[PDB]
Amino acid sequence: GVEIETISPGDGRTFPKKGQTCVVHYTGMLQNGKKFDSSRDRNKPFKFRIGKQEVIKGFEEGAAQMSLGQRAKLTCTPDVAYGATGHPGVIPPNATLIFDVELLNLE
């Protein structure tokens, strides 16, 4: 389950498609918890493509549901990111995930 809560500005029309490499300034957040990940810190804005299952399932569906210049607000369920396993030391099992996502892409 991906729930988009959009900070408006941008275009609203340029949607990501297959075979397109897109550029995202992400910033993670734990529900009732601190930060755990940020692309703003390294300033390397995480170039990745669509449809190769490189990212987790919750981040993948919210990427296509944005457009150029926009700023969404993800809410990833535990069963789509890590909630059974949990990433060791970084993500606990049965975790609900929040992401500050900006789509400033190409292609």
Curated annotation (Swiss-Prot):
Classification via PROSITE patterns: FKBP_PPIASE
Activity regulation description: Inhibited by both FK506 and rapamycin.
Tissue expression summary: Detected in heart muscle (at protein level). Isoform 1 and isoform 2 are ubiquitous with highest levels in brain and thymus.
Assigned EC number: 5.2.1.8
Sequence ranges assigned to domain PPIase FKBP-type in this UniProt record: 19-107
Enzyme class, spelled out: isomerase
Record keywords: Cytoplasm, Isomerase, Rotamase, Sarcoplasmic reticulum
GO MF terms held by the record: calcium channel inhibitor activity; calcium channel regulator activity; FK506 binding; peptidyl-prolyl cis-trans isomerase activity; signaling receptor binding; transmembrane transporter binding
InterPro entries reported for this sequence: FKBP-type_PPIase, PPIase_dom_sf, PPIase_FKBP_dom
Annotated compartments: Cytoplasm; Sarcoplasmic reticulum
Bridged cysteine pairs (disulfide): none
Purpose of the protein: Has the potential to contribute to the immunosuppressive and toxic effects of FK506 and rapamycin. PPIases accelerate the folding of proteins. It catalyzes the cis-trans isomerization of proline imidic peptide bonds in oligopeptides.
Family to which the UniProt record says this protein belongs: Belongs to the FKBP-type PPIase family. FKBP1 subfamily.
Name by which UniProt lists this protein: Peptidyl-prolyl cis-trans isomerase FKBP1B
